Design a protein around this ligand. Sequence first.
Ligand SMILES: Cc1cc2nc3c(=O)[nH]c(=O)nc-3n(C[C@H](O)[C@H](O)[C@H](O)COP(=O)(O)OP(=O)(O)OC[C@H]3O[C@@H](n4cnc5c(N)ncnc54)[C@H](O)[C@@H]3O)c2cc1C
Lengths: 492, 492, 492, 492
Amino acid sequence: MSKAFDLVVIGAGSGGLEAGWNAATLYGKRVAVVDVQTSHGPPFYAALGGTCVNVGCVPKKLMVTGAQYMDHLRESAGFGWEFDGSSVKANWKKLIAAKNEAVLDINKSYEGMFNDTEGLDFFLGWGSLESKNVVVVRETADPKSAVKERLQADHILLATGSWPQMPAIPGIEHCISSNEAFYLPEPPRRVLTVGGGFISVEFAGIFNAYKPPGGKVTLCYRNNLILRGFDETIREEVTKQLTANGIEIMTNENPAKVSLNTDGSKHVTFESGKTLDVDVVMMAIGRIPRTNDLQLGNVGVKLTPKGGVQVDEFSRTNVPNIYAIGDITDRLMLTPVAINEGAALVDTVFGNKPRKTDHTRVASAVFSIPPIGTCGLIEEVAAKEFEKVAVYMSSFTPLMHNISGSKYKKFVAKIVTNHSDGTVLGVHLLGDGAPEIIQAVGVCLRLNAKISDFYNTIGVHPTSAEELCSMRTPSYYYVKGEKMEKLPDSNL
Amino acid sequence: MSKAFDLVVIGAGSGGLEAGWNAATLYGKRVAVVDVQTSHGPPFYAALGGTCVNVGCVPKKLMVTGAQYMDHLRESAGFGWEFDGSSVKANWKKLIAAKNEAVLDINKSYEGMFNDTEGLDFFLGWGSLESKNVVVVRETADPKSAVKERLQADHILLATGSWPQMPAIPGIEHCISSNEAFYLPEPPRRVLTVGGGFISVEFAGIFNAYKPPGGKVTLCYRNNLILRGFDETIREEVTKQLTANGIEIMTNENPAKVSLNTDGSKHVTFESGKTLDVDVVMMAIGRIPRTNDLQLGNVGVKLTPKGGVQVDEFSRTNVPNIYAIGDITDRLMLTPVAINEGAALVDTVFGNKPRKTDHTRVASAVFSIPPIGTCGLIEEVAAKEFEKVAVYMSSFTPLMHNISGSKYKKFVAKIVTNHSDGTVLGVHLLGDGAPEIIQAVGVCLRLNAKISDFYNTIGVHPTSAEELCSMRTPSYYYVKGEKMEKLPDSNL
Amino acid sequence: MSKAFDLVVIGAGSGGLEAGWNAATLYGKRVAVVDVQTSHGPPFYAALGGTCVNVGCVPKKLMVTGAQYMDHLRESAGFGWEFDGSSVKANWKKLIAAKNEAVLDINKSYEGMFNDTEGLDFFLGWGSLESKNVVVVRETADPKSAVKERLQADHILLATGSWPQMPAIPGIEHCISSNEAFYLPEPPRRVLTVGGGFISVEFAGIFNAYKPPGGKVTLCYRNNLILRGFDETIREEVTKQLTANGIEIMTNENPAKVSLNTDGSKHVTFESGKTLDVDVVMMAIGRIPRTNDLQLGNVGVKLTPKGGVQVDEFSRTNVPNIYAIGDITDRLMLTPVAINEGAALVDTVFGNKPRKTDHTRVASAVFSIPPIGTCGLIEEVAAKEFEKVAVYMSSFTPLMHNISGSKYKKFVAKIVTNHSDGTVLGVHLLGDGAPEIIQAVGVCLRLNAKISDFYNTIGVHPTSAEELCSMRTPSYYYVKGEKMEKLPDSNL
Amino acid sequence: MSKAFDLVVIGAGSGGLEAGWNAATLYGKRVAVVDVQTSHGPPFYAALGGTCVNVGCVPKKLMVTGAQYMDHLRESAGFGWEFDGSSVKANWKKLIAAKNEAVLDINKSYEGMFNDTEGLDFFLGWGSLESKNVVVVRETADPKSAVKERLQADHILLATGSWPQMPAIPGIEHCISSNEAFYLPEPPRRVLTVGGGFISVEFAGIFNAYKPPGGKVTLCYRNNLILRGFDETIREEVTKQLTANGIEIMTNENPAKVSLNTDGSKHVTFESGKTLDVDVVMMAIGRIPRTNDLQLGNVGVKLTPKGGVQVDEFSRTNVPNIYAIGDITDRLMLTPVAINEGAALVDTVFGNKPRKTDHTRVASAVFSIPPIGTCGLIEEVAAKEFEKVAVYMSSFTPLMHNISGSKYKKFVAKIVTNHSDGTVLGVHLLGDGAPEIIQAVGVCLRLNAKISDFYNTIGVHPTSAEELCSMRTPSYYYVKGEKMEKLPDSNL
Ligand SMILES: Cc1cc2nc3c(=O)[nH]c(=O)nc-3n(C[C@H](O)[C@H](O)[C@H](O)COP(=O)(O)OP(=O)(O)OC[C@H]3O[C@@H](n4cnc5c(N)ncnc54)[C@H](O)[C@@H]3O)c2cc1C
């Protein structure tokens, strides 16, 4: 009578929701959506709305913003502003509440989105894969828990997202991930964030601003330079500026074991013998695709070398009617990229207008203090797949920071082109504005903009973004992998 | 031998310097630049560096930045920041002193650029035309004053910029302009900025931030809406947000006379009849090309019916070998335009490649609070030029401001389109980050981007700039010049 | 919330219903019941109530009763009754309607039994076995049909009953089983029933009485003597009396192929070359257990050599929580035996008072004309497992049939005892009353009654049943398998 | 030498013959049997074979059978049998002639049994006692008639049965008894059977079947309920079903006188005063032991205060070597009792094993329409004998009669129990098959079966007898003689 579902979706995250909406309202298809909670917070943290809405994008931005105010208050003095210095109090409990209320606002809107949209229904519980055309809902992630629904399905979309990767050292239970940090009752006086990823950096600034008096935020990384994957010079600069803002950046170090002290504080011993005491140890060493609770072996879905789900240029798997998008693919773990993959999966199946999502020249940010904006390739990657590479550099200390009292906040801007046709292959910004600036840059790369298009454009003065139009000559080259300043006069 | 150059520049301003520097460093020419001061301030205000550096873009940006801190301190309470609210106060003298140091530093650097660059020489004095090939440098703007130098010139470049226009009302002696506002001894308690332009608006925000307790900024404009020539919706939102911060906006009002009070304050009387008592009256009704002291009549350089120096698309005047750029041409009065006008003038005259400054689709800004970023045409003009016009629109109060408490700060992002092909004709933003976002939006219009190129781009989550890649259907249309919520019938 | 079912039952037959009732009302267990129809008749014939209620016990008795009236009318003449002989009409269409209304009466009562008994719910559809704890309901018997329910189950009872066995000869589609005979639009003029089982015999009498004028009921059997399994002398007698009543009993014959004539009648060719034309060919060559539509391979349920389901003395299978009762076990295909097995399965599981059903010394009947009553062993089976066997025989022509005009209706009565202790091992009756007589006899065997208990009881005169008390001396013996009249005087 | 035997039997009836046959064939004794006729009918009615064969069990059974055909022809319409209803009629002469042939055949066989069995001799005449060891056979029942034989006897067995009791009312000359009813020339149109016993009831059904058009059977009984000594509920159901067939039942009525009408019919006048005109008046108020013509006073054989011959449990009279059995002892007046009484008498006297007839728990019947089968005690008596008494009951209209149209024919099946152990004390059935069902029920009571032994037995589907194995809980109880719907309190 009620049949199956033209589509069932496991995980109502960024990608999950964009696929079920574009199907119930765009194609009148029957759609079901299974997620393990309706509201943010423990025990599962991620809930209806995805990691982005509950324990990612939205709440992180709000908290970084609040953390920027530490710098604002300090810098206002250069501009003549005075107020009781010792009376300032960073109320963490007040910040988390404001955040929680914002997140729950989104939790409810989606909560109502389902209650007035026929063909779109929400099922609370854990979704495991039974047959190649049946999804199993259970009260818990345990494959042997009570069943509450069995959703007959024509198409099945896997959008369970990703999960924080934890190492195998003794005492790892005394550690937290990005998940639990959003819900600390009090701001930790001493915090150690492990790893060099954008998550460890972004939370280091947040903890650094809301820490009570006498606090030290220590960030450790097992290799030499943090923020592996981002442009080189931006890496070393951000390291310098994090140090300036009081954060101890402790490189070439890896925790080896953690214990509890007589007062509940964590005692951390490293692989190099050095010990450090902290109130909170946060693991941000990577995110793995979330596939264990899915029982993907019951149908024989294939996984890549990394624990991720394998797919093609259309998000299809080996099983004929099973698709996967979002962070479960182990590709570009970004929210707009999962919304693009999800919107693209639908109108290629339920709309016979096949259009796949492009995974290259994608804009991303890193709301650190200072923030980062990137798009396209970095110079050392362009080298390994391009004849002649040109690099445009420029690192002025911004206009206002001679007065502000923050001389260290050097703004950086790099452009990477194929020197053959001057086409821009990358754009890498460090400094306030980088995130908002790069967005419009992503449209340029989608338009195959050559460097001439940039410096021939009239600037908006006075801005930092105008520095992208002020670079007319390369600072060095990358020809057949080698890096030399002057470009040797020896053609062909 | 001596005193025989390739180029003489009257005015070490934006356009002038760029012209001379390029001429001397890029083409090894003997260049001479004349200006009335080497450092900012009275009695001549403008100086080495131009109006922008000494009494324009640079200084106001710093002062706006300082006025933004009134909002920051207040908005921080929403993010858990506590401190004695009653202890906040702005020191107007510390703002000015800090601004003087910054501007002075640029003055110091530009000098020494002359000392270290051969073929580039500076001459302190007042420049004027004596013949078709001779610039005279006198000790004052008066023709009767002593001659300092006579410079032989194969080419003369007029680059003296513009000057504040002051209406000839009785009591005008008791008023100031933008020039002197940069140097007030104390912040005015009651102030009246006159004019609906960007100068009056921007300054209204600065005075509103630093006014002592019980102050009141008052802006008046003789017409019904401020910021003529900007997108209307933005014009009206900036009016609302200004009123939301404390600024009173007196429209359809124009001062008729000013008189002194016993205490020494001012007594303004408008045309309509009303009266206001204020401590300062700042005039910002416009700026006129600075042709006054150049003796253009000795050579016959023809002026425009609007009052600027008449020039073709290559900056050539009616007199051979004499050129004009910048505010003196009375076109687009923006620094990057003059700079680009100068760099192009040099390439054309001393190179083997003609270059002319494209004057359309120039991205400019307005540093109100919040700021404005724009680029291209606005609705009205597009409807006069194209067959079918589409308007993509998006307006909301960002989440970060529902928490800060500044709920009036509604973001705005219009997009004007030619619906006959989709090419973007203009972009108009309002809110935090608008000036930075718009910069790369100028590269896209130079590339003739289409509305699809924007929504087909993957966005950066979460940012204000996303809103540009998210408007897919027109909010309304403009067919044959008439506005309508939807199109005609079927077509195709 | 609603969990699983303390018990789900596939097939709502004689056994199915007795198990779900004794559980919902006796033990407050949650119970589900899956059957493929609510009302009798095509296309599935058997429906809610089982084979017994729809196409077995109840409707067969009603039709045999109606068929007995052919003999009644004939025999009344001996007692002085007269009426128009040629005006008698056996209206088959009127009989089937009266039957259908009786069956549907039962169909509805059960239909209401479910609607006012919490914990007892009826599910329409086909039940297939998914996991070892899930039953699959489908719109049809096709394993690839749409699903309407998936019943989570704690215990699973298999009670699908049995199905008519059809041979593999060309033209078998032109044949019918016991199922379709209950719904013939008209009574067949010429009918051939295949097989020697009680079903072929019972329907031969029914067709024989309601056949239109000029009809011949031919019963064929592939071996020598019909009614294999019943006592020997009763077999040969019933053959004789069926012949007397006009039925052609054609032994040592088996159909080899069947075709259609120009008029729709079936043309039957035998393995011996002889041909016969009939309007209806009814196959009653055996009943097989009904397991194909159950997908028993999905869980690995074990089957006996015969296609039946294997079980122990408690109706349990290899799969821990899967039980089977009724005709699906391939044991004693009787309705009271499935009601006993079903009532016994429950209060051994949901009542921890384990009591199994006894499969020996069970009373059964054969409502032929004349009818048969049996209970216990037959003489030739007692031989193969008993030292000394005694047989008591007695074959009087009943009181009333010297007048009736039916001298052939010889009533028979055999008793079989273990000659050691005289315990009665069997009792075999032929003649009207046999079914009602034997029932009370079954209680005697449950009481280990010796033969002395029988002939020492005072008879009810005049009856046929009194002949069981009138046999005081054996007619022959079976000692160590051999059959001799006198019992050789040579003991030990 | 001659006329000197081992046993002389007065009365070749049921008990007599069984006695002599066993004596002569089982023990090789010289036996002589005396009776007044060799064939049934007037003037003596009873004859060789006893009352049962000639004017009792045998003939009525045939006549009841013939009366059952009135119901069969009518009930057959429900099963699709059609025929001219108005053409049915019963030929009372053909019934009698056919019954005469059947009875005569038994008469013929019993004779020739004498002709072929040595030591067994028959003597036609009237037997009476002349001395303790001499039986005289005279030509008529009168002592003054001629002596035919004088038989010397070591043992004399009185077995002359009983005789109809006729009340001494005026007009009794115009009435008949059961004897003459077996020989009426024509069926009475109006008839009045007198008595509430089984004879009056059974005959009422026969006359009701064969009455000519516009007839009316009328049964009267001087008390309030017919069939005293039978189970009450059955008594009242048989009354209802009799009234349902056409018989009028006049209770609390007793005829006071009969007189002749002009036409030759009868004019009955009851005690209460009412009057009825009928064609025949049949008396069946009881039967008295036939001691009239035996000359018991010549020897001193003592009679019972109730009028029968006094005998101990071994059939011995006060006079040595003289024995009595059957109706003449005035105990249970049933054929199998006398037979069993005879067979036991012979075993005791001419064997080496004493045997006495158990007179309790004897299963008898009553061939009304529908019939009655019973065995053991009824409610009332059990309550006088046992502590706690349980009554299992079941009453319904079988399905076959909801179709036949005879909806009054409600089956009944009581079961009386001693609730102190469960042993079955009695069984009472009403409806088709009751006489046959009850026979084996007599074997069970001899085995002291318990109520559990019945419901724990597997039934025969579908039959009336099932109802016995289906009553599990008492319908009501009888504690200390008082009736109550449930027991006392708790106990155990
Ligand atoms: C701290 C942090 C900051 C980030 N910041 C940014 C940022 O600034 N910009 C950006 O673009 N991206 C950011 N990301 C990444 C972004 O949140 C993810 O890439 C995005 O959520 C991917 O979408 P998705 O639907 O595939 O995953 P998700 O949105 O996480 O979807 C997973 C959902 O499925 C549910 N689920 C999982 N398993 C099951 C199951 N078995 N049954 C039922 N439901 C299940 C989960 O509870 C969850 O609700 C950030 C991530 C983190 C952790």
